[PDB]
């Protein structure tokens, strides 16, 4: 594609913001964002404490230098620091001492499932040497108690508490175990961005300037003989190319083509609802947990026989975070609370949706290469890529590279490799 | 050209020797000479009498995992030996008030003081291999780390591998870098390690059983003299004749036993450096830290520590075996103190072992690789820690590399990570 083209990026989440940021180096870019900030799932909400204002990540928060080399380099290039926020996990079920945790060997669920936690690490480490985690567990003789009291809870930390996590791709889970992201024996190795995840997006927003249109949801995207027409904010805008950084769900709604292969490729993408509640109600902390960053509680009334229908809640104790250590205010995040959180203690709520990561869903992502470039249209974002923020931002980069702007970090071996892998995965 | 049914002696019955002999015996008439009363060397499990049974407590070698040690793991699996996760939780204590850090939680004044440095270090060790023939100390100096980090954090955590007498800050950087990137050592989590069920001695017990009368226990070799006919082994007041002789002893021992006019041997073997280690199996609970909660490894630096005299001062490392998951019902205290400064109450001491470890300075690695020049000459072969990558996998795989060269192929070719490790160690050894 020809230089100085008029390009629109639709959706200002991580993939869109990074796509736009790089595209603007060669093209006349405009970034449309439905909401009042750049970042989407990457949102840091200001909380007022006894130490000043903290920007508390409510969605996206975790990455590391190995898993997310491009995001890491981006942060580093921007002067943004990071810190280690280990994924310590405590799981509570109804009963007396019906728990296990990441940090120690205490709890009755640990006594009950000790052998299984052990074998699972071994097997996940031996695995990399296309099924679901559940199929694997069934097939390799793991107890139903392990599936629903250990596996499903630990996976909800990724997938949300409404997610059919046991149907998600095994390699996703195997890799997380072998890379020390999830573990039944130690707190996993993760980092957070200093000043919250929003910090890198703040800089992208500053760099893009008036090219960014906030609170401007795109209503329709209509390719024509002359170009592509974007209906947003009660006006009509004209472009040569349009980059989609929105979810497949949204993209289909916004897309206005006679072509019905679009309905085929974009319809049928499956999602999971997630509610993130930022609150100060300490009653959500476990009396046995407390110390653990991630605290999963399964409510009273759980039955193994009907486990498939029941769901818990996940609470994050932000006070455990090193930079929050002098803060005397409780800072808590409950994802998918079953009971209502005391609204006199609630700071803010966010409602989002995540993709399902079943092996069929992975096939569905890859197939999007068929419509890539057609009718002056491009696609990036989580639904075109590997899961996680690196996958998201790198998809944006893959599109920018295809549209003239090369991968910005070629001398960074792991960053370049990730770009190459994601470009291959996208079929671009 | 070496051929089948040769008379081969393996000198030294530690891990490398026992595995070398075990595989060699498939093709050759093998004899295994061992100085001590058991097969295993640094791999020693001592029986301890408790109210829930007699436990075989590893005093030396204890840790490995399925990724780091694929050949040993497969060997254990083939023998029907189970393993269990024994995470490397570490607690460090220095003389003041709450002058500690640990890798389970963010408590302690040393954590407060050095938290940011721990953090940067992880980042940098993870970024290192994707880019440096310095030592860990040179790195630390050069990348602006405080002296307090070098001696209150790095040196103590490194003693878990190296021993408390070790100049660990002189050891190769990539050794440390890899340990941090592979979650073996960490300032943020307990590292991923396994132990063998029934102790490490279990796999050796089986090798010993399989070898039978080919094993000569309590038979230290006095001299190894190559002749025009073959090689002569002087051991136990007798003279034994062999076609080939496989050395599985430390380089210093090898040079002492080795008897030739050739002085390239003196050049290649004479400059190997070691560190003494004393392992004390006891029941004196006064050695546990009052703050060092559930930590497996507990390092204590005695009163009188001075940062200026850090180079010459040394702590002690205590292992709390009662924290091990299979030892959870044991009411008896089971403890191992490495290099105790003060004497352990001898009315509470079960047994002591005295060993020596190699130094792993960048020069020492160069020295190991160099041993390819004498490999095969005068019917002589060399395996063991001083010819290989450090650790038990490196040790047992060196034994395998020699067995492969002498006709018996690597036993696990269809195990991709086991085969890869063999290939790497064979390349490193230059065999
Ligand atoms: C609660 C939660 C926690 C998470 N935690 C992590 C984590 O710790 N680590 C990690 O790696 N990943 C995490 N993720 C995954 C996350 O989805 C990805 O990391 C990444 O943020 C998704 O990138 P995206 O740009 O494709 O999606 P989004 O961030 O969802 O971006 C889509 C954007 O499109 C906008 N949009 C919608 N409609 C329109 C319209 N009509 N016109 C214009 N714009 C529109 C939206 O407002 C939004 O800004 C989390 C997700 C959730 C929901
Ligand atoms: C305290 C301690 C703890 C350790 N812990 C671990 C751990 O957890 N994990 C790990 O991977 N590694 C560990 N190691 C490292 C250890 O060096 C290797 O794992 C491995 O045991 C070395 O095996 P080797 O056969 O090369 O040497 P050694 O085990 O030292 O064996 C050499 C053998 O030669 C014999 N010998 C000596 N002189 C003569 C002679 N004249 N004639 C015949 N035989 C002789 C000795 O008795 C001995 O059995 C530890 C070492 C020590 C000292
Ligand atoms: C390295 C890289 O980018 O590639 C791998 C992806 C490994 C994942 C990205 C690791 C998971 C996320 O980064 C972490 C997501 C986050 C912590 C979940 C939601 N977070 C919260 O709720 C926080 C903890 O509060 C490849 C996998 O991606 C595919 O989507 C997946 C289904 C696979 O099959 C591949 C193995
Ligand atoms: C690939 C491989 O197998 O080896 C790598 C090094 C990683 C080590 C082998 C890990 C160290 C040991 O296996 C474990 C040491 C052990 C815990 C010793 C002491 N233990 C105790 O004293 C108590 C009982 O726990 C590569 C490095 O090996 C070399 O020896 C080293 C000097 C290097 O620089 C290489 C990079
Ligand atoms: Ca406080
Ligand atoms: Ca203080
Ligand atoms: Ca010292």
Author numbering:
A (entry chain B): 4 to 132, 140 to 438
B (entry chain A): 3 to 133, 139 to 438
Q: What is written in the article reporting this PDB entry?
A:
In order to obtain complexes with LC-KA05, mutants E64A, E64Q, Y182F, R326L, and R326Q were soaked with the 1/7 substrate mixture followed by rapid acquisition of the X-ray diffraction data (owing both to the low availability of LC-KA05 and its high instability, it was not possible to carry out co-crystallization experiments). Of the five mutants, only E64Q and R326Q yielded co-complexes with 1; 7 was not observed in the active sites, as the acetate of 1 was clearly visible. The structure of the LkcE E64Q/LC-KA05 complex was solved at 3.03 Å resolution and that of the LkcE R326Q/LC-KA05 complex at 2.50 Å resolution by molecular replacement, using the structure of the LkcE/EMAA/DATD complex as the search model, and the presence of LC-KA05 confirmed using a weighted Fo−Fc omit map. LC-KA05 lies at the interface between the substrate-binding domain and the cofactor-binding domain and adopts an extended conformation. The substrate sits in a deep pocket (∼ 20 Å from the protein surface and ~ 6−8 Å wide), and is surrounded by hydrophobic residues (L70, Y168, Y182, L185, M189, W200, L324, F345, V396, and G398). In addition to these hydrophobic interactions, binding is likely mediated by seven hydrogen bonds: two to the lactone ring at the entry point of the pocket (by N179 and T397), one to the acetate at C-7 by the side chain of Q428, and four to the lactoyl moiety (two with Y168, and one each with E64 and R326). Notably, in this configuration, the lactoyl portion of LC-KA05 stacks against the FAD isoalloxazine in a position appropriate for hydride transfer (the amide proton is situated at 3.2 Å from the FAD N-5). On the other hand, superposition of the R326Q/LC-KA05 structure and that of the holo wild type shows that if LC-KA05 bound into the wild type in the same orientation as in the LkcE R326Q/LC-KA05 complex, its C-24 hydroxyl would sterically clash with R326. Indeed, the fact that the R326Q mutant retains essentially wild-type activity means that we have not simply captured a non-productive complex with the enzyme. Taken together, these data are consistent with residues E64 and R326 playing critical roles in the catalytic mechanism (although R can be substituted by Q without a significant effect on activity), whereas Y182 is not essential.
The enzyme LkcE from the lankacidin polyketide biosynthetic pathway of the bacterium Streptomyces rochei represents an interesting test case for understanding such gain-of-function, as it exhibits a monoamine oxidase (MAO) protein fold yet also carries out a macrocyclization reaction. The catalytic mechanism proposed for LkcE involves initial oxidation of the amide function of LC-KA05 to an iminium ion. This is followed by attack of a C-2 enolate anion on the iminium to give the 17-membered lankacidinol A (2)8—an enzymatic intramolecular Mannich reaction.
